[PDB]
Design a protein around this ligand. Structure first.
Ligand SMILES: O=P(O)(O)OCCCc1c[nH]c2ccccc12
Length: 239
């Protein structure tokens, strides 16, 4: 289903959507695919990170690159994941590799590989609307980030360019409230959720990203379901 439908389904079920984040090729190519199999049952949508040169996420990118991850490698993995699910798949990437390959080619390749959209953490959309438009015209939803320091004007500016959803990073209820005042777009948040309690604090958002917690689980060689189940139980809105 579409990104909006994935978020809507979660909301209707009275819960914040669970969005696993997995670094492409971490801890290995096979390990990554196995991880995808384990998180999909819990995922409303999935984020796949393109490793490029937070401490935990940094460790994962570092190991992935040391093992040979590349844009071509990430492309094949996106195809592999698309073969396993019809759920929304978002590629998170810094601008550097996009510029190296050329925006039109980079975005075109990932859209063709099966990506639903891209998350561009280091691109203020208002600074290059043309680049944003290009990705959108190619068929990719474009997610941009907002920090707690964002003024009303900054929030308004970013939500004007975002599609799919808006990503708020680091209290959570306050930031979510302020963003919803300027948009009907789903709002996902990421602040190191690691269990039921921290997930409950984030339950107010339309979606909650889980990245660092999964890196740790993978490093420790633990099954992922127990962790995701605790988080899912915390994402469920109660009386
Ligand atoms: O919030 P955590 O610890 O679950 O990480 C979620 C991973 C999303 C993520 C990966 N790399 C980033 C760079 C900037 C902002 C967010 C990210």
């Amino acid at each position: 289903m579409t990104t909006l439908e994935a978020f809507a389904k979660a909301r209707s079920e009275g819960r914040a959507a669970l969005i696993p984040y997995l670094t492409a090729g971490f801890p290995s190519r096979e390990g990554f695919l196995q991880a995808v199999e384990e998180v999909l049952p819990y995922a409303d949508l999935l984020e796949i990170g393109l490793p490029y040169s937070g401490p935990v996420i940094q460790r994962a990118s570092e190991l992935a690159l040391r093992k040979g991850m590349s844009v071509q490698g990430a492309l094949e993995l996106v195809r592999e994941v698309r073969a396993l699910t019809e759920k929304p798949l978002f590629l998170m990437t810094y601008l550097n590799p996009v510029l190296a390959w050329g925006p039109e080619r980079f975005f075109g390749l990932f859209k063709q590989a099966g990506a639903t959209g891209v998350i561009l953490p280091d691109l203020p959309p208002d600074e290059d609307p043309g680049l944003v438009r290009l990705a959108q015209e190619i068929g990719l939803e474009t997610v941009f980030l907002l920090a707690p320091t964002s003024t009303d004007a900054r929030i308004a500016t970013v939500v004007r360019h975002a599609t799919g959803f808006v990503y708020a990073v680091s209290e959570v209820k306050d930031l979510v409230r302020r963003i919803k005042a300027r948009t009907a777009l789903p709002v996902a948040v990421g602040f190191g959720v690691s269990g039921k309690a921290t997930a409950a604090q984030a339950a107010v958002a339309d979606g909650v990203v889980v990245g660092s917690a999964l890196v740790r689980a993978l490093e420790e060689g633990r099954s992922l379901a127990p962790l995701l189940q605790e988080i899912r139980q915390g994402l469920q809105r109660l009386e």
